């Protein structure tokens, strides 16, 4: 449930989670289809699963 951002991701709404390359994100929900939910720096939202790598 711990992943590291491979790329920057810029949220397009407040359902989505922004992060920078190298940020550590904690996965809160795994679904298939290319989107996971996670939390970073007190915010929770969805992000592309192929934008991160498991630690």
């Amino acid at each position: 449930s711990v992943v590291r951002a491979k790329f920057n991701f810029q949220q397009t709404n407040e359902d989505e989670l922004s992060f920078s390359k190298g940020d550590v994100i904690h996965v809160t929900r795994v679904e298939e289809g290319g989107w996971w939910e996670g939390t970073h720096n007190g915010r929770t939202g969805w992000f592309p699963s192929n934008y991160v790598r498991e630690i």
């Binding site: 491979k6 989107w35 929770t44 939202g45 699963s49």
Partner: peptide, 16 residues
């Protein structure tokens, strides 16, 4: 507490 729905849009491609 209510959680955000999974995006309906397709996941974006990784930056090239």
């Amino acid at each position: 507490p209510s959680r955000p729905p999974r995006p309906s849009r397709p996941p974006p491609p990784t930056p090239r």
